Amino acid sequence: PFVPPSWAPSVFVPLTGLVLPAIAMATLFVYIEKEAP
Amino acid sequence: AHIVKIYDTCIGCTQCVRACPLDVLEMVPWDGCKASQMASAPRTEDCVGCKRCETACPTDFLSVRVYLGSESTRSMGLSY
Amino acid sequence: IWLSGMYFHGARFSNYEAWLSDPTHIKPSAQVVWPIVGQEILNGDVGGGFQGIQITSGFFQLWRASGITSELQL
Amino acid sequence: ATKLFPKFSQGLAQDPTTRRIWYGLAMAHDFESHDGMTEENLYQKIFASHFGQLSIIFLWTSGNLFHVAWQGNFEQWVTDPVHIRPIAHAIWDPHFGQPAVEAFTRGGASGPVNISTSGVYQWWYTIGMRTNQDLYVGSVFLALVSAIFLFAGWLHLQPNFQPSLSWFKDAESRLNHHLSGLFGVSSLAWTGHLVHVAIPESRGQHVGWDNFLSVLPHPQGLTPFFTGNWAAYAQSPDTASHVFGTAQGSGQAILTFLGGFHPQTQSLWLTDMAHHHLAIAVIFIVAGHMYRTNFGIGHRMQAILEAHTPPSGSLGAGHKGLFDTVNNSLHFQLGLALASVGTITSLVAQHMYSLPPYAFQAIDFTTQAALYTHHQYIAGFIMCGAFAHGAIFFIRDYDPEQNKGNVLARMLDHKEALISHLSWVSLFLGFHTLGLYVHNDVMQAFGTPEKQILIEPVFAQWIQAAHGKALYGFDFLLSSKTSAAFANGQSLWLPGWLDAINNNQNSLFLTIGPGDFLVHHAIALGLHTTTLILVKGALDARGSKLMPDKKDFGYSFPCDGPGRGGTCDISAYDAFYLAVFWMLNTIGWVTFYWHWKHLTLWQGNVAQFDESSTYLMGWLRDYLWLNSSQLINGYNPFGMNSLSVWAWTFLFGHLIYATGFMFLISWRGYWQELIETLVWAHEKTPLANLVYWKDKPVALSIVQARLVGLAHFSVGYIFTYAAFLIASTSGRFG
Amino acid sequence: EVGPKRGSLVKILRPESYWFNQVGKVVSVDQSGVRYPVVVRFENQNYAGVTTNNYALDEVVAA
Amino acid sequence: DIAGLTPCSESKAYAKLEKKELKTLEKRLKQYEADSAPAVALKATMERTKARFANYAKAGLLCGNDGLPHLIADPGLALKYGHAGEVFIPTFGFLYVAGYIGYVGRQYLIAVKGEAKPTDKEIIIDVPLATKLAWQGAGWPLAAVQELQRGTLLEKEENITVSPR
Ligand code: CLA
Ligand code: CLA
Ligand code: CLA
Ligand code: CLA
Ligand code: CLA
Ligand code: CLA
Ligand SMILES: CC1=C(/C=C/C(C)=C/C=C/C(C)=C/C=C/C=C(C)/C=C/C=C(C)/C=C/C2=C(C)CCCC2(C)C)C(C)(C)CCC1
Ligand SMILES: CC1=C(C/C=C(\C)CCC[C@H](C)CCC[C@H](C)CCCC(C)C)C(=O)c2ccccc2C1=O
Ligand code: SF4
Ligand code: SF4
């Protein structure tokens, strides 16, 4: 009623290892360097 | 910019001025001591905070203080 | 003064002649400790009827290279 | 330029260096010194932040439940727990090779799982879980609760529900609710869960959310409770021929008082824990009506503080005016909280190695090791935080005129005596402890081991004889058969305690000797020293004779330059900075000591400890060198086995640690010049002078690098010791 | 007039001074409108290596 | 006995350790001659070793399960069961000599503060005065309690305290 599928580590591991770090670091890097108007 | 404050125990012996490597201190006329002088800090935007003024002051606990504050491109001494 | 000390300790407190008689199986020793609180266990069985601390400074090979055969010359 | 990040400090978001990034990460939770910070705004931000922390905690626990329930083998572990190992979670790493995955697949699983050295399995088996489904239900519930707390944290920032300032600083109404509700009602409800679920699951039954409304917890049921026949809940308890998860020798009692251990499971009885939570629930609920709320009978804390000034003026004003500094400041309350929580954490560790509560604990030994070590190190960090916030209190929130003549000014008046005597005891313990250890080493190195000082710790053995350990031949107060205490307690709660204290196989009151004397003195040296550094940093925070206006600089300032002989590391921050090293050392001693004593206990030869524990070569050869044989053989040119990851972590720790030395030994300006030549090189290089920095590169500032070096030192230290402990204990017994 | 006479031993009461609560010897007392007229020597030196300092009237006590 | 041990006279582990040490020592002794100074020193070691074991057995020492002597640090217990010569008498001896050293030093310091240059007589010891004071304090505790009871042991609050509070 809840069970994650058998293929779940294969997808969720590289997602949170490579994608979310990439989006996080890119977004944060744009945030850091922004100039105040 | 840093915060440089001159206090009234100053005897006006010009040691702090000759020790400043950036020319932020100068001697102004004053009527409170024997030498009739007193130091002043009119240009604390050029100060980098090296604290040679504190080392050169003879009177115990000092008549000049350098409080550290928000750095800038001149107060970091960056030449590039 | 240091060199003189080394040659003297080689002359008096060592087993240099017993080493010249048989260089293998007899290990070089040139220092002897005094029998006090228990440091006398530091005197090792260096071979040749002698007891002491094995030296690695290698003065014995130097002395044999110079031709020294007796403790008197040391 | 005048960049956006960060918005809390304008002077920080001004400079064109890379100092703004690090400092913006560092001053984010320093709410007291942002731009435009009032006091109401401060309290409200702290409130919402607390909600955030609660959300993270509950979400984390849901994560543990979910992974145990999905990838573990809790359904198979409950049939035989002196056997098949716990399973924490499963691995999917694409970097593995064939023998790696072939090796990690252990514990009955079908892939790369790793063993759970956390003690969650025993906890959940004792409290009454039996299947996976219950664990999943718990995980969903806790995730939901975490979402609720996150939403509430968002709620109380919205401008209609923001509590005003005076809703905070309401001492008397917060303690009645905390003491009565938060402690008492929670404890009472936990008694409810023990009685209704945990006991009948330990009798053999499935009391679930289904049919708990139609099952008698005791076969009489609320007749004796309303009659006053309460001892009828304790008749015929569980027989000592009990088997835990079945009905064999099952009793009927629900509230006993036995003491001792379970004879088959080596834990405390569940009925005693029901009775205990019930009793202290009553105590806390009764204690929650002390103070005054919008009613009559309560107390005022200010009156209580005012009236306790002693006559003859041995204290000047006593506690006059403290209530306006405990209430008005946050660092004072935080200091008290960290002190209490740290001491309680230590107490948790000290009781949970000796009196194990959970079923089939203390037969999983790695669980014992990791739990005790974990809580000890946590306690250390918490106590250091307590003294640090003491120093911040003195610098930021102390006011002399409000505190004229109370005990708080008296402590500042005679502080040189305190620092002097802490220095004295530190010196005394240091000289004599190190001297005795060196003397024993010299005697052992020469051929004479009988010529060494072995003082017998007769005080602690006197105490152990006082508790009932009938081995030292002292015969008094619990070991003597004709004492008053022995005879009075004999009929109901002693005979379990005596059988549990005369067993030489459990951890309860281990036999002690001269090595324990020496190590306990080493521990006392650690405590007095660390207290010296911290207390000195706290009390000399207002000012010293080297500098009598240290209060004008704040807590963490670098130095005062080369003048007056040069003043490096003069801030209170740097005093705490020095104290952290001592904390790490002292916990190192207590944990080395505990670990080796229990290794020699679990292996079988206490003689090895009682002989080799009295000289430092014994430690170096018989603990660090002998027990690291299966660790560093985690991988070799011949193969690898389960504890390869530990044997890689074990080097990882050293690497971090050695990098930690760099930020400590080599101070700044050298790196400034090096970075400047780098700037020249990147500026004049053709085909790479098309990419510039936006913020100029500078070296790390003086204060920061201390923190960074300490971070590396601590992290490497922790990883190295954790690797050694888990790998050694689970390699032998695991 | 204004101060204790030279050669006398005084006791410092200015707290921030390194020689607080100690004994020094007076050299000269300025008679003009200076804010700190009393010149006191000391037999030991502070951290900066100076052994002489000015002080106010109320911060020294003839003792 | 005293916290679950036995005296070394009937302690089995004591004699085993004694035999073991003699065994290793004779093992070292075997390979030399009967007149050699190695054998002389080895037999000296045998004599000192056996004498040491006899001396430790004679003094009524107490051995655990390792056969090693254990000291008892408790006034009532050691004075009751005859062990005053392992902690109690040593602590009073040490306190005597340590207070002696401290008192002699302090008397020197006060003796040299009264000169025209206290630093020179600190860096260059006044040897006649130092030997004189080195004798004059063999009974220090009496002079110490007199200095205490007259109130000259302690300076008053003219000590320099940190500024500010
Ligand atoms: C907070 C506790 C926690 C922790 C530490 C972990 C840890 C892990 N989970 Mg996980 N998980 C959790 C709770 C947790 N889980 C919960 C509550 C669920 C139910 C939704 C899941 C469902 C889940 C699945 C289905 C899988 C994992 C997997 C994994 C492993 C690979 C990392 C990964 O991809 O995670 C991914 C984790 C999630 C997608 C769930 C996280 C959901 C919350 C809302 C995010 C929390 C945000 C976080 C606090 C902010 C930190 C980032 C910030 C610093 C920028 C790793 C061991 C993988 C695995 O088992 O490989 C063997 C995998 O396939 N998790
Ligand atoms: C420089 C190298 C050197 C070194 C390292 C040693 C080291 C040693 N020698 Mg040795 N020795 C040396 C040179 C050296 N010697 C030389 C050049 C000679 C020939 C003269 C000797 C002749 C010699 C003999 C005959 C013996 C040793 C012995 C020893 C051992 C014990 C020394 C001892 O107990 O002192 C005793 C301690 C003292 C004398 C203390 C004196 C300290 C005074 C009070 C200091 C005063 C300060 C003063 C201002 C400065 C000194 C000035 C000077 C003119 C006195 C020791 C291993 C003994 C040995 O091996 O026994 C097995 C031994 O019997 N040595
Ligand atoms: C009965 C009503 C009630 C209840 C239940 C609470 C409960 C709480 N309040 Mg609260 N509050 C109340 C009334 C109440 N308050 C009133 C009337 C006021 C107005 C005066 C306040 C004002 C107030 C403020 C201003 C704040 C709180 C906060 C909190 C939270 C404290 C953090 C926490 O989780 O502690 C949990 C603590 C325990 C569970 C007790 C620990 C006991 C010992 C130390 C632990 C050991 C026991 C045992 C061994 C543990 C077992 C371990 C297990 C894993 C095996 C907590 C949820 C704080 C908070 O977090 O805000 C969100 C906060 O900042 N409250
Ligand atoms: C109840 C918990 C608690 C709370 C609420 C606070 C709250 C506060 N503390 Mg405090 N503190 C605590 C516990 C706590 N502390 C403990 C236990 C210690 C002892 C270590 C300290 C030591 C301490 C000091 C020494 C100082 C504070 C300061 C502060 C204030 C600002 C915090 C800040 O800006 O940090 C921002 C936080 C960060 C930048 C996070 C840094 C990350 C650290 C280094 C951990 C990194 C390790 C890393 C994650 C390991 C990864 C391993 C890798 C292999 C994956 C704030 C009021 C400061 C203050 O008041 O300034 C005047 C201050 O100087 N505290
Ligand atoms: C460092 C603290 C300390 C501690 C823990 C002990 C511990 C002990 N001492 Mg003890 N003792 C000490 C310092 C200490 N001593 C010092 C400094 C002196 C010199 C004044 C003595 C003089 C002394 C005597 C004369 C006797 C003991 C005895 C004892 C034993 C039982 C009495 C007891 O614990 O009283 C609690 C102790 C304290 C709270 C510390 C203060 C020290 C007081 C003065 C000692 C109290 C003696 C006690 C009243 C005698 C009880 C008789 C017993 C049969 C019931 C116990 C092993 C008795 C014994 O031989 O037991 C078999 C005994 O007869 N002691
Ligand atoms: C001879 C003068 C003298 C006297 C009376 C004292 C007395 C005292 N010292 Mg002290 N001290 C001295 C010399 C002296 N010391 C020297 C030379 C040093 C090292 C440079 C120290 C270092 C020192 C520290 C670091 C501490 C004390 C402390 C103390 C107090 C506790 C006793 C203690 O722990 O001693 C321990 C003594 C030592 C660790 C070193 C002793 C060194 C030798 C043995 C003494 C010097 C002999 C002297 C040169 C003889 C000259 C006389 C001769 C010319 C005629 C006590 C008031 C402690 C304190 O404050 O307690 C509250 C403390 O923390 N002292
Ligand atoms: C710095 C500072 C601070 C802090 C401090 C601290 C941190 C402290 C700590 C403290 C502590 C941490 C303490 C502890 C304590 C403890 C105790 C005090 C204990 C007691 C115990 C007892 C009393 C017991 C008893 C008993 C016994 C013996 C056994 C049997 C039982 C009985 C119970 C009888 C503050 C914040 C305030 C502020 C100011 C500054
Ligand atoms: C190396 C070194 C530098 C130079 C350090 C520099 C230039 C910074 C090096 C860090 C690089 C740029 C990135 C490191 C990679 C980390 C993983 C970054 C982590 C960032 C967190 C936000 C996660 C100093 O400035 C310094 C100052 C004072 C004492 C000692 C030292 C010192 O040892
Ligand atoms: S700190 Fe340096 S630059 Fe600034 S005033 Fe003093 S001497 Fe001049
Ligand atoms: S050095 Fe000091 S006293 Fe001299 S002029 Fe400068 S501030 Fe005044």
Coordinates of C-alpha atoms in Angstrom, one line a residue, chain D residues 429 520-533 582-583 585-587 589:
Chain D
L429 CA 47.0 15.7 39.1
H520 CA 40.1 7.8 37.2
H521 CA 42.8 10.3 38.2
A522 CA 43.5 11.0 34.6
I523 CA 39.8 11.7 34.0
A524 CA 39.7 14.1 37.0
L525 CA 42.7 15.8 35.5
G526 CA 40.7 16.2 32.2
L527 CA 37.7 17.7 34.0
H528 CA 39.6 20.1 36.1
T529 CA 41.8 21.3 33.2
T530 CA 38.9 21.8 30.8
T531 CA 37.0 23.6 33.6
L532 CA 40.1 25.8 34.1
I533 CA 40.3 26.9 30.5
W582 CA 40.9 19.2 26.0
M583 CA 37.3 18.0 25.6
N585 CA 41.3 14.4 24.8
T586 CA 39.3 13.7 28.0
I587 CA 36.5 11.9 26.2
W589 CA 40.5 8.8 27.8

